[PDB]
Design an enzyme around this catalytic site. Structure first.
Site, PDB file in Angstrom:
ATOM      1  N   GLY A  53       0.825  -1.207   0.000  1.00 43.09           N
ATOM      2  CA  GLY A  53       0.000   0.000   0.000  1.00 43.09           C
ATOM      3  C   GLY A  53       0.858   1.255   0.000  1.00 43.09           C
ATOM      4  CD  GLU A 158       1.555  -6.338   2.110  1.00 40.55           C
ATOM      5  OE1 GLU A 158       1.716  -5.125   1.991  1.00 40.55           O
ATOM      6  OE2 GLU A 158       2.421  -7.183   1.860  1.00 40.55           O
ATOM      7  CG  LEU A 244       3.854 -10.020 -18.853  1.00 40.35           C
ATOM      8  CD1 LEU A 244       3.944 -10.059 -20.383  1.00 40.35           C
ATOM      9  CD2 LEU A 244       2.897 -11.083 -18.364  1.00 40.35           C
ATOM     10  N   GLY A 245       7.181  -9.215 -15.264  1.00 43.70           N
ATOM     11  CA  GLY A 245       8.593  -9.047 -14.894  1.00 43.70           C
ATOM     12  C   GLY A 245       9.401  -8.453 -16.045  1.00 43.70           C
ATOM     13  N   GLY A 248       7.898  -7.301 -19.403  1.00 43.44           N
ATOM     14  CA  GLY A 248       7.075  -6.073 -19.511  1.00 43.44           C
ATOM     15  C   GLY A 248       5.659  -6.273 -18.998  1.00 43.44           C
ATOM     16  CG  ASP A 276       4.408  -2.819  -4.277  1.00 41.39           C
ATOM     17  OD1 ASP A 276       3.355  -3.351  -4.647  1.00 41.39           O
ATOM     18  OD2 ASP A 276       5.101  -3.236  -3.333  1.00 41.39           O
ATOM     19  NE  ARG A 309      18.667   3.059  -5.461  1.00 45.10           N
ATOM     20  CZ  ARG A 309      18.807   3.999  -4.536  1.00 45.10           C
ATOM     21  NH1 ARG A 309      18.725   5.277  -4.877  1.00 45.10           N
ATOM     22  NH2 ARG A 309      19.017   3.649  -3.281  1.00 45.10           N
ATOM     23  N   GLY A 311      16.972  -0.753  -2.532  1.00 39.24           N
ATOM     24  CA  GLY A 311      16.425   0.195  -1.581  1.00 39.24           C
ATOM     25  C   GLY A 311      14.899   0.205  -1.544  1.00 39.24           C
TER      26      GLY A 311
HETATM   27  N1  ADP Z   1      14.619  -7.624 -14.466  1.00 37.87           N
HETATM   28  C1  ADP Z   1      13.834  -6.627 -14.887  1.00 37.87           C
HETATM   29  N2  ADP Z   1      14.192  -5.825 -15.923  1.00 37.87           N
HETATM   30  C2  ADP Z   1      13.401  -4.817 -16.336  1.00 37.87           C
HETATM   31  N3  ADP Z   1      12.200  -4.553 -15.779  1.00 37.87           N
HETATM   32  C3  ADP Z   1      11.744  -5.282 -14.738  1.00 37.87           C
HETATM   33  C4  ADP Z   1      12.543  -6.382 -14.230  1.00 37.87           C
HETATM   34  N4  ADP Z   1      11.860  -6.937 -13.220  1.00 37.87           N
HETATM   35  C5  ADP Z   1      10.704  -6.246 -13.081  1.00 37.87           C
HETATM   36  N5  ADP Z   1      10.642  -5.252 -14.000  1.00 37.87           N
HETATM   37  C6  ADP Z   1       9.567  -4.257 -14.128  1.00 37.87           C
HETATM   38  O1  ADP Z   1       8.724  -4.346 -12.981  1.00 37.87           O
HETATM   39  C7  ADP Z   1       7.408  -4.765 -13.366  1.00 37.87           C
HETATM   40  C8  ADP Z   1       6.872  -5.780 -12.371  1.00 37.87           C
HETATM   41  O2  ADP Z   1       7.779  -6.860 -12.270  1.00 37.87           O
HETATM   42  P1  ADP Z   1       7.668  -7.878 -11.048  1.00 37.87           P
HETATM   43  O3  ADP Z   1       8.665  -8.981 -11.294  1.00 37.87           O
HETATM   44  O4  ADP Z   1       6.215  -8.205 -10.793  1.00 37.87           O
HETATM   45  O5  ADP Z   1       8.185  -6.966  -9.800  1.00 37.87           O
HETATM   46  P2  ADP Z   1       8.301  -7.525  -8.283  1.00 37.87           P
HETATM   47  O6  ADP Z   1       9.747  -7.945  -8.181  1.00 37.87           O
HETATM   48  O7  ADP Z   1       7.953  -6.406  -7.357  1.00 37.87           O
HETATM   49  O8  ADP Z   1       7.295  -8.641  -8.254  1.00 37.87           O
HETATM   50  C9  ADP Z   1       7.550  -5.334 -14.770  1.00 37.87           C
HETATM   51  O9  ADP Z   1       6.350  -5.165 -15.522  1.00 37.87           O
HETATM   52  C10 ADP Z   1       8.700  -4.533 -15.335  1.00 37.87           C
HETATM   53  O10 ADP Z   1       8.219  -3.274 -15.831  1.00 37.87           O
HETATM   54 CL    CL Z   2      12.959   2.956   2.697  1.00 38.06          CL
HETATM   55 NA    NA Z   3      15.090  -1.781  -6.805  1.00 38.70          NA
END
Ligand code: ADP
Ligand code: CL
Ligand code: NA
Ligand code: ADP
Ligand code: CL
Ligand code: CL
Ligand code: CL
Ligand code: CL
Ligand code: CL
Ligand code: CL
Ligand code: CL
Ligand code: CL
Ligand code: NA
Ligand code: NA
Ligand code: NA
Ligand code: NA
Ligand code: NA
Ligand code: NA
Ligand code: NA
Ligand code: NA
EC number: 2.7.1.15
Lengths: 327, 327
Positions: A53, A158, A244-245, A248, A276, A309, A311
């Site tokens: 949140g 959550e 989709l990580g 995209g 988030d 990065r 953090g």
């Molecule tokens: N390794 C990566 N390279 C580029 N973009 C990423 C990568 N991992 C996540 N993202 C970005 O973050 C968004 C969400 O990814 P996700 O894996 O769900 O994040 P989280 O680690 O918080 O679960 C993706 O749609 C993409 O835009």
């Molecule tokens: Cl923080």
């Molecule tokens: Na980060």
């Protein structure tokens, strides 16, 4: 009082309301994970501001969103720290509720960097008492937080599920655009309860696992993700985005042919809180008047930047930091 | 400012100075210990106030001691929480130091009630920067905390050892009665460093293991404890107390014939912090004008009461609880 105060004329009424979690992250770096019965020292420790949140509110607030956080924290120092930190990140805290009967929600997180493994124990604490009946009692049955001017609601998974669902339903009935990011992944009893509320969700924005859990459609790739979109429209969701990580996202605006935009190619150092970042950034851009695809393209860019990065919240961009052409 | 303020005339100056640790205890109750890579929820959570330094100060403060805590905590809300808790338990906080560069010290504690097992990760945080040089800088070379009127210093082994040793030496050179409870147990290089300082220790009050480590006498029982007293006297310690858990304590005042007093016959429910209760209470009784034996007999009774309840500082008795003639 650390918290913001509202005016009587709603001169600071937000564009975006986030109704969700605030957790402190207690991060202990360890040489090894403790064995049963073991007492050890950390090598170092990091205090961080988490909760999906708050994370999403802060992502938006950092980009300049007119965003307010509705949550429950303790009367303890942790609560006070979080209230101040939200303000320093451009999030209004007028509807941060405080209870003297609970500590602020937190996660106890152990990190072995050598092994790149974590152990995480979530202690929702005050969050457990963030109920619909309390929310109603504190907001005159949602009147105080769902003013006519309100454009967006963001919820996650959550806090107590009825708080999430009831809020979404109320907000939708007033013509607020509701955004539901079903994270962390709903458990089977949660899925059952969520599905009837999906007609009150303007935008369902899951990841692959959560899309799978809701639809039954096993989502591993673009083609299957498109299939999950159709399933979610059939369940009554207007707009759908599935992240989709590194691949995209996919989306469909109001039942249009779906689109796939692949990930930005970056050097992922730490992806914690990237989802988030995407959600909060996405809603910020929509609040600035961009359509779903335009918002998600820029959200995709902000999240990519965040993964470069460490953090969590600290890795979320401010506008001055962004390469030209994102804002 | 949460902390106490000292007067220019020194009208509120303490009898007892505790120079040592303050740790928050963040306790997550779990149905099973996390395995590598696992994220789970707790079944409940408890926040306690720990650190052997604070524990010993609060044991004394509960009984009415004119005690002051010297330590370092964060500028974080956790640090403010401890400073208020200390005051509510009769401990003066004017020489609590606060750093913006470190979190407040804490322990992250996982408890499986079913299996009766714990995992503990100690995060000393701010405490690690509580150095002699910082202490001197902040106190005008100890002058601010070692006022003429000061009767007692208590130290443990839960801050940087040079801070403990230098403080003891300085206090002792000023005619303060110095009390050193070498807990947690000294490591082999700490033992080497401690021994040359033992002539500046008025009262060395170890448990059996600590006494063993310091003296090279294997201490398991009364008769071997008595031998340890001699070895400690040879190293230049004036007064010796060795606590023996359920078997009570042994002592010698200033080379007098050693005495054993056995433990009270109580149902031990939770002995966490009982040693700290003993040490703190002991020094309170001495500040009231009891001699070592009288003070230790009453400490033994306080510590006994404490083992009959959970919760560490929560288990430390108030004066109303004590049998006639103890106070
Ligand atoms: N390794 C990566 N390279 C580029 N973009 C990423 C990568 N991992 C996540 N993202 C970005 O973050 C968004 C969400 O990814 P996700 O894996 O769900 O994040 P989280 O680690 O918080 O679960 C993706 O749609 C993409 O835009
Ligand atoms: Cl923080
Ligand atoms: Na980060
Ligand atoms: N089982 C017990 N019965 C009676 N008194 C006890 C018991 N355990 C501890 N004590 C009291 O607490 C003091 C210190 O005991 P110790 O075992 O060192 O405490 P801790 O559990 O904190 O290590 C003893 O000298 C005694 O007065
Ligand atoms: Cl407040
Ligand atoms: Cl709680
Ligand atoms: Cl759609
Ligand atoms: Cl790219
Ligand atoms: Cl930052
Ligand atoms: Cl203060
Ligand atoms: Cl406590
Ligand atoms: Cl720290
Ligand atoms: Na803002
Ligand atoms: Na008092
Ligand atoms: Na902090
Ligand atoms: Na007092
Ligand atoms: Na200070
Ligand atoms: Na023994
Ligand atoms: Na006597
Ligand atoms: Na106890």
């Amino acid at each position: 009082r650390a918290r913001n105060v509202r005016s009587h004329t709603g001169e600071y009424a937000p564009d975006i309301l986030v109704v969700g979690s605030c957790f402190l992250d207690y991060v202990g770096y360890v040489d090894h994970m403790p064995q049963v019965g073991e007492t050890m020292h950390s090598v170092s420790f990091h205090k961080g501001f988490g909760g999906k949140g708050a994370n999403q509110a802060v992502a938006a607030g950092r980009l300049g969103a007119k965003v307010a956080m509705v949550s429950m924290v303790g009367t303890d120092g942790d609560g006070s720290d979080y209230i101040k930190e939200l303000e320093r990140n451009g999030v209004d805290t007028a509807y941060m509720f405080r209870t003297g009967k609970s500590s602020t929600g937190l996660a106890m997180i152990l990190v072995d960097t050598k092994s790149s493994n974590n152990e995480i124990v979530i202690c929702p604490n005050a969050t457990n008492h963030f109920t619909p009946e309390l929310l109603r009692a504190q907001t005159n049955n949602y009147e105080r937080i769902l003013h006519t001017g309100l454009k967006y609601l963001i919820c996650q998974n959550e806090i107590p599920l009825p708080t999430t669902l009831d809020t979404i339903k109320e907000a939708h009935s007033r013509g607020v655009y509701t955004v539901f990011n079903s994270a962390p992944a709903p458990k089977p009893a949660e899925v059952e309860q969520i599905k009837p509320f999906l007609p009150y969700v303007s935008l369902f924005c899951p990841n692959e696992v959560e899309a799978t859990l809701i639809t039954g459609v096993k989502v591993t790739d673009t083609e299957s993700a498109f299939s999950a979109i159709k399933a979610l429209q059939q369940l009554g969701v207007r707009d759908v985005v599935i992240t989709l990580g590194a691949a995209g996202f996919v989306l469909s605006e109001n039942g249009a042919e779906p689109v796939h935009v692949t990930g930005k190619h970056v050097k992922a150092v730490d992806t914690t809180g990237a989802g988030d970042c995407f959600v909060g950034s996405m809603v910020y851009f929509m609040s600035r008047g961009r359509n779903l695809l335009e918002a998600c393209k820029r959200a995709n860019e902000c999240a990519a930047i965040s993964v470069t990065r460490k953090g969590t919240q600290l890795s979320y961009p401010h506008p001055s930091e962004l390469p030209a052409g994102v804002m």
